[PDB]
């Protein structure tokens, strides 16, 4: 689809293009439109039909390439510990992102469950006193283990008492080394040979 002297658009590895059309193709459509363009018959009221049916909508753009997204998970999550008993996340809604260029304080990334009856979308400047103090906000500024297959097998064998191994390797530490860390030297001195005479 090269137009003139320009190369066709190159879709990159993880790119998605928004659809160019929002309706299925009707072949006769254009012809009928031409008729309805010339007739100028005031028979049809579109606003009347709008309330008699559901609005035509479309969703966010999704990937539809062949063999596009195929993944493997080698991990099973095991959760241990009482935690703080924090409330259910589901009842807190979407996390809002509010960032401002002029704010020294970093961007806000979090939920908002305060409830008002006066801050309306119809009036952004409508004040709601006694619930929000209208002053400058920016004045100044247990365990969830991810087991692999081997560790999952060992956990099923042992139970909640199981914990993943933390390998301990000490690099080559010689008696002639001068800049070697003394901590490793002492840990290896813990295994120093004892002679008998």
């Amino acid at each position: 689809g090269s137009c003139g002297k320009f190369a066709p658009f190159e879709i990159k590895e993880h790119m998605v293009l928004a659809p160019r059309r929002r309706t299925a193709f009707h072949p006769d459509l254009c012809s009928q439109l031409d008729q309805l363009l010339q007739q100028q018959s005031g028979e049809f009221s579109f606003l009347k039909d709008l309330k008699g049916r559901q609005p035509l909508r479309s969703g966010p753009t999704h990937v539809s390439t062949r063999n596009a997204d195929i993944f493997n998970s080698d991990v099973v999550i095991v959760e241990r510990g009482k935690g703080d008993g924090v409330p259910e996340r589901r009842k807190f809604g979407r996390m809002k992102l509010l960032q401002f260029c002029e704010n020294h304080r970093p961007a806000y990334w979090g939920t908002w469950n305060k409830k008002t009856a006066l801050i309306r979308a119809r009036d952004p400047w409508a004040q709601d006193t006694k619930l929000l103090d209208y002053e400058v906000d920016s004045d100044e500024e247990k365990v969830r283990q991810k087991l692999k297959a081997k560790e999952w097998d060992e956990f099923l064998a042992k139970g909640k008492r199981f914990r993943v191994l933390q390998p301990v390797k000490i690099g080559c530490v010689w008696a002639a080394d001068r800049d070697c860390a003394g901590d490793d030297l002492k840990v290896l001195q813990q295994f120093a040979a004892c002679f008998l005479e």
């Binding site: 081997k150 301990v168 690099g171 010689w174 120093a192 004892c194």
Partner: protein, 380 residues
């Protein structure tokens, strides 16, 4: 050094009991053999990648064994693969010039004469004599060429869980479960040295304090695999106990050729008990020596070796008192065997959890190899 723990089970997640590299290799890529409870002996190809991480390629599977295979050992030339197991028969495999195999191996000799499980095998330097230890309280010497039993040592009172052969061809050492180390003369075919007890310095109030050197049945490992030094000068025996105060500590004893009835020293291993000892076949030039009487033995060269306990591996050399390497907590169960590669670039560790690991060393990291490997003063 680098540690590469394998996250894929070689023997269907069954315990891996033994490992050994093909000592006959002279290049950069090596052949490894593993024995497991799955009644299989698997041969793999081990080489370093461009980044330096070890990579394992599956080569062959040898399923002639009927029960669990406990020990796998390559002949010094790397041509004959000895495999022993719970079926009391030792198979000698050779490459013969079965869909899964990239290369094929067939049994040449079936060494018979044991009554119970075979736990350890040691070759002789010439490659014509073999020695094996078994549960049946006997250590058997074999004529490899004849394929027949030549001698039986039944002086043991319990399971025999390790045999080593003198590189100088004078002694054969066996470690048994009766807390007794035995050294047999290769010529007299009798017991030369018996080492079980150890005097504990001077006892309190003038008492004659003597304690048993080696561990009891509490040992979680089937094996007590001791080893000679490649030159023959020293003998390293794991599963030893030292009573420092009122407590006991696990250790590996070091004996000399001069007297075999008392060790020079002991390498202490706090924590678990040591079960395997394996030496690097490369003679290294001595480090820049800070002059002290620290060396285990005083010779122009030095030798690196590894002692594997239930959950750790310690990397020692000859001249230093402390080990230069320590790795631990890489396997969820007891380790079984350790084996060096021919060039010293690899140290393969097997554990009973079903997975194995490698300790890799880059160029000249262990040391500077000798220009010429020293000639041995064999006795025969």
């Amino acid at each position: 050094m680098k540690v590469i723990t394998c996250e894929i089970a070689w023997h269907n997640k069954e315990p891996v009991y033994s490992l050994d590299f093909q000592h006959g290799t002279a290049g950069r890529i090596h052949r490894l053999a593993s024995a497991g409870v799955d009644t299989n002996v698997r041969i793999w190809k081990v080489e370093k990648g461009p980044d330096g991480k070890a990579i394992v390629e599956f080569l062959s599977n040898l399923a002639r064994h009927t029960k669990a295979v406990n020990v796998v050992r390559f002949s010094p030339t790397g041509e004959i693969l000895a495999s022993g197991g719970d079926d009391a028969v030792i198979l000698l495999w050779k490459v013969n010039d079965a869909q899964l195999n990239k290369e094929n191996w067939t049994v040449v000799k079936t060494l018979r004469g044991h009554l119970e499980d075979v736990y350890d095998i040691c070759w002789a330097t010439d490659g014509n004599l073999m020695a094996s230890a078994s549960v049946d309280n006997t250590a058997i010497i074999w004529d490899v060429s004849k394929g027949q039993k030549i001698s039986i040592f039944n002086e043991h009172k319990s399971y025999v869980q390790g045999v080593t052969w003198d590189p100088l061809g004078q002694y054969v050492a066996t470690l048994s479960c009766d807390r007794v180390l035995r050294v047999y003369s290769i010529q007299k075919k009798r017991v030369a040295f018996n080492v079980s007890k150890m005097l504990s310095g001077i006892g309190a109030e003038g008492e004659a304090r003597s304690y048993r050197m080696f561990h009891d049945d509490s040992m979680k490992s089937f094996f007590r695999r001791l080893s000679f030094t490649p030159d023959g000068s020293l003998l390293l025996t794991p599963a030893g106990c030292v009573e420092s105060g009122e407590n006991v500590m696990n250790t590996t004893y070091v004996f000399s050729r001069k007297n075999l009835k008392r060790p020079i020293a002991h390498l202490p291993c706090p924590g678990k008990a040591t079960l395997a000892v394996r030496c690097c076949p490369v003679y290294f030039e001595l480090r820049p020596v800070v002059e002290t009487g620290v060396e285990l033995m005083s010779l122009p060269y030095r030798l690196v070796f590894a002692v594997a306990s239930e959950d750790s591996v310690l990397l020692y050399d000859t001249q230093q008192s402390f080990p230069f390497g320590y790795v631990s907590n890489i396997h969820y169960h007891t380790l079984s065997d350790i084996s060096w590669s021919s060039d010293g670039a690899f140290l393969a560790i097997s554990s009973t959890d079903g997975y194995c690991s490698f300790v890799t060393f880059e160029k000249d990291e262990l040391g500077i190899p000798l220009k010429e490997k020293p000639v041995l003063n064999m006795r025969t």
